């Protein structure tokens, strides 16, 4: 595979990804994986570089061949979800002053972590569930700004009245929760920095939990 | 490329098609076409003959060649779209009894050809333009079950209550078209040829319509 044509394929089409990887897959055809934004996508290509594109519908002559590519989206997709938990773990770890630890109901060595944003409906959902998270493990949260001005108002308000008292915080949270409420004027730092770091993990959509490993 | 691959790249997965064409792209890949039961598709193939796929996200360095592939599947759905149409409309010929026959507002010597499912949600939209319809052509109207038991009876029921009555028929077809109504029990033969026989021209999708052009 020639990586200087699949740059040069890239640029055409516009794109803002670093080659990572090809593999050879036979028939003049390599699996591509290209990282944007430190996210990891994967392709397929032909030998030459001249041409990216991924498939829906994949037929091969040889079975081994048909398998192999759903090993690679397989593979990658897991390595992946377990990089983006590693990286969010660590900024949970970092960012400790601005979490909000909920123990659970009865003792537990487990924790959910979940990112989530004030405005974002689901989140809303998930906030409404969280009790009912308590039973199972204990809940690490973090709110951040993603969809607006608001958001990231509502974000920086719950960071000062933290207080670390989990009752008085979840009632807190509680009304930044609520459908169409309004974020109190304050500085944003903070939670923009806050945000930017859970951003830079490769989390994008809300309401993103990760829950305790199995099997 | 390799036509005796593809061949025998097609029994390997199973796919009882014909290899109607094979066209070289570049990079070692080529246009194909592949026939199953006078239906054909467009696909991509290896020149080897061991690889062959849809894409639905192509990125190509010369981007004439990412147009080139637009243009080949264009030009299929097209005639595709034209093959369906002259077998529909012998479907329609020969199935006349079967077929809501509504002469336009005024006369007219064109007509617009509807295959239409009870059930569909844009099928009884389209059925309440059908004024609108009328006003510009004739319209032939088959109504087929292809969603399950309740537009296989409510296709049946049409066809036995049919009148031949423009009004009184417009007036049925409406109740069959409300979405909480539903089929009343009775033999579905007829209604399943009639279903069977659009099919088999490759009519997949609800409403399906010929417009004269």
């Given at each position: 595979m020639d990586k200087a044509e699949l740059q040069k394929t890239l640029q055409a089409n516009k794109i803002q990804g670093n080659i990572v990887s090809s593999s050879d897959l036979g028939s003049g055809l390599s699996m591509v994986i290209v990282e944007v934004n430190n996210q990891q996508a994967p392709f397929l290509a032909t030998d030459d570089g001249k041409m990216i594109f991924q498939a829906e519908v994949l037929i091969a002559q040889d079975k081994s061949t048909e398998s192999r590519v759903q090993e690679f989206y397989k593979n990658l997709y897991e390595k992946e979800?377990?990089?983006?938990?590693?990286?969010?773990?660590?900024?949970?770890?970092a960012q400790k002053a601005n979490v909000?630890?909920?123990?659970?109901?009865?003792?537990?060595?487990?924790?959910?972590?979940?990112?989530?944003?004030?405005?974002?409906?689901?989140?809303?959902?998930?906030?409404?569930?969280?009790?009912?998270?308590?039973?199972?493990?204990?809940?690490?949260?973090?709110?951040?700004?993603?969809?607006?001005?608001?958001s990231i108002l509502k974000a920086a308000n719950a960071l000062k009245n933290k207080s670390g008292n989990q009752a008085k915080d979840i009632a807190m949270l509680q009304k930044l929760y609520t459908p169409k409420s309004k974020g109190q004027s304050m500085d944003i730092k903070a939670a923009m920095a806050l945000t930017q770091a859970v951003a830079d993990t490769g989390v994008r959509s809300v309401p993103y939990i990760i829950e305790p490993h199995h099997h």
């Open positions: 979800k377990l990089r983006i938990s590693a990286k969010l773990k660590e900024v949970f770890k909000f630890t909920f123990k659970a109901k009865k003792p537990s060595n487990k924790t959910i972590y979940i990112v989530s944003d004030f405005n974002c409906p689901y989140c809303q959902r998930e906030f409404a569930n969280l009790d009912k998270r308590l039973e199972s493990a204990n809940v690490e949260l973090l709110v951040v700004g993603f969809l607006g001005e608001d």
